[PDB]
Structures are given as structure tokens and as C-alpha cells.
């Protein structure tokens, strides 16, 4: 569900990605770390919401969801429920219900100067031969020798 053009509870009411998303996703299983012998109930997800979230929009509202015509005054009932639910992670749960750690990287390039990008690959230095050289973007052809 963490991909452009998807649908589902997570893709709609938990985390929505833009359709022109730049960057990408790295995810890996973390059962050996996020699992408890008695059941780990520390991770929540939103189950009830009126409408889908906009891309890159977070919602930490913890008001009681209204599922009927009667507006409750903050006390849960037959049609008033907490919109957050706890996961049932268990280390013996089958693959598909096991915890996974997910990171999404998004690259933004603005009119401002570019600042974040990869290391520059340098080669060795040789002297006393006519070569093509490139030092810090300055290119040329010639022989390099020791100076005073």
C-alpha cells in the first residue's frame, strides 16, 4: 500500500504518497526486535476517518469517531469509538502479519543551491606524463610536475 496509486486503510487514513513521488522506499522485516512473547501493543493505526488524507499529511487527532446520527459528548458507546487501533504483533504470527520497518526518502530540488548528493570518485595522481586532468572541475591537458 505504500506506493503511488494504491488504496486501502493505510494508504488512505494513515499515510498517503503523492502520485508524482520522487525518492523511494526501503523496508525490512523486524520481527526479532518488535515482537513480545505476550504480545506487543505499542503501535497504533487509524481505522475510522471521514475522508482521505492529502499527500504528506499527518493526523494526530484523537477525538471519538461518530458512527451515527446521535452526537456523543466524548464518551464511547454503541456508535462512538476510538479511531486508533493497536496491532496484534506476535513473534509466532505468520509472514504477512509480522512487523516491518519502513523508511521513505524524498528528494527535493528547489531553486536554492543543491546541497545533498553523493561522494565524488577520485583516482590516483600521476606526474611527468602528458595526461588529461580534471581538478575540482577545472579540466586541461598537459604534464604535471613538482613546483616551488
Amino acid at each position, epitope marked *: 500500500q505504500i506506493a503511488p496509486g494504491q488504496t486501502g486503510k493505510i494508504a488512505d487514513y494513515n499515510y498517503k504518497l503523492p502520485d508524482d513521488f520522487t525518492g523511494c522506499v526501503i523496508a525490512w522485516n523486524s520481527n526479532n526486535l518488535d*515482537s513480545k512473547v505476550g504480545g506487543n501493543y505499542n503501535y497504533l493505526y487509524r481505522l475510522f476517518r471521514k475522508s482521505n488524507l492529502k499527500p504528506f499529511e499527518r493526523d494526530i487527532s484523537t477525538e471519538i469517531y461518530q458512527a451515527g446520527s446521535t452526537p456523543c459528548n466524548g464518551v464511547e458507546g454503541f456508535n462512538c469509538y476510538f479511531p486508533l487501533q493497536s496491532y496484534g504483533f506476535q513473534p509466532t504470527n505468520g509472514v504477512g502479519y*509480522q512487523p516491518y520497518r519502513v523508511v521513505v526518502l524524498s528528494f527535493e530540488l528547489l531553486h536554492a543551491p543543491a546541497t545533498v548528493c553523493g561522494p565524488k570518485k577520485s583516482t590516483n595522481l600521476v606526474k611527468n606524463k602528458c595526461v588529461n586532468f580534471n581538478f575540482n572541475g577545472l579540466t586541461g591537458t598537459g604534464v604535471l610536475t613538482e613546483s616551488n
Partner: antibody
Amino acid sequence: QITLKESGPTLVKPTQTLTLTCTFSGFSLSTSGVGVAWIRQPPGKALEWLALIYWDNDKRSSPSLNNRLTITKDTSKNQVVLTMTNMDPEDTATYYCAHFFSHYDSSNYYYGSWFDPWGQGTLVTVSS
Amino acid sequence: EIVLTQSPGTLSLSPGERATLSCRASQSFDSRYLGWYQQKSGQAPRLLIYGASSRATGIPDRFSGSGSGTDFTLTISRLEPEDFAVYYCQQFGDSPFTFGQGTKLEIKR
């Protein structure tokens, strides 16, 4: 190899508080999958688990005694402190502190969990 | 809670024969949550088998286990007088984690 020794006052009057301390060597409370358990056994009767502490500060206590159970950890000095309040005269038992570790092999399959070496155990009698 | 019952209450044999013990669970849970521990007289219990299918470090091959559903069994083929003690079966299915009442292995004469 790991060692775990118990300590604390063994003579406690009724309906005051009791505090036991377990000192452990050969392992630290920072490794993944490492926890410390406190268990008690009344003399002549079966064992009874009391509490569990995880490496990531997660705590588990007995549902019936969770009102009067507390567990704390000291990583630098490697100590585990267990505190009970409102002691009962029927709580006379022997207390053990044990290591806890689960087995995973590069694929997160959880080949069961166990109680690897425990402590010596200290005798606690609560009477007036 | 989950209740584990050990059968029989007391089992006494002679040194040399095979010893069989059973641990039955009140409810049904994963077979990987069941383990067995050994306690001697005036000594702290030690890990014996974990996961109901795996032997612990240094545990002799004489000790074996098999079970599923709500029933498990432990088998000893050639027992020596150094293993007449009490055995506990334990579960991890549901909090609180409970121990069996124990079965005492007695030397027969």
C-alpha cells in the same frame, strides 16, 4: 557463562514493603533479546512467575499482583530491583532472578523462548 | 488463564527403564511456547528443553519431547540415578505464564 545472585533483607514484618536486588554478570541489559525475570516459589508448592523486564524498558507483571509489584533496572552497575508492597504472611517463599533469551536465526522465525540460567534464590519469611 | 496439568502426579521406576511424562494444556496454543525445566532437591531449577522440540545446551540426547494441540509428552530412554528429581512444564501462550505443578521421579526398590 553468566551469573546472577540475589540479595536483600530476608526478614520482613507483615504489611510493610520488601525489596530484593539481583546482580548479574556475563551479560548486560543492552543486548537484543535479553531480559531479566523474577520468580517466587512457596516452600513445598510449585513455582510462580512474578515479573519480566526487557532490554528496551518494556515491563510485564502478574495480572493479580500488578497492584503491588514494581521492577527497575540499573544498566551501568548491572542490577535489577524488585519491590513489593503490603506483604502478606502467606507470601513466605524463595525468590529467584533468571536470564531470558529467545532464539532467532537470520530469518525471524522465533524457535521458542526459554528461561536460561536462574539465580540462587533467597528465602523470605513474613511473620510477626 | 491457561492451566497445565502433569501426568502422572508421581512416577516411580527403577534405574534403567524408560520414563514418560505428559503435560496437557487447558486451551490450545502454539507448540513453540511449551518448555520443560528440571529442579533437584534443594537446588535451583535449570533449563531442560525449549520450544517443545529443541534440546538445550549440553542436555543429553536421552531426553526427548513430542506434542501438539493441547498435549505434550517427554520421554527418557536410559535414565541414571542422577536424574531422579522434579520436572516442570511451562507455557508462553497467554499471560500470565504458568508452570506445571510438577512430577517427582522416584527410585523404586
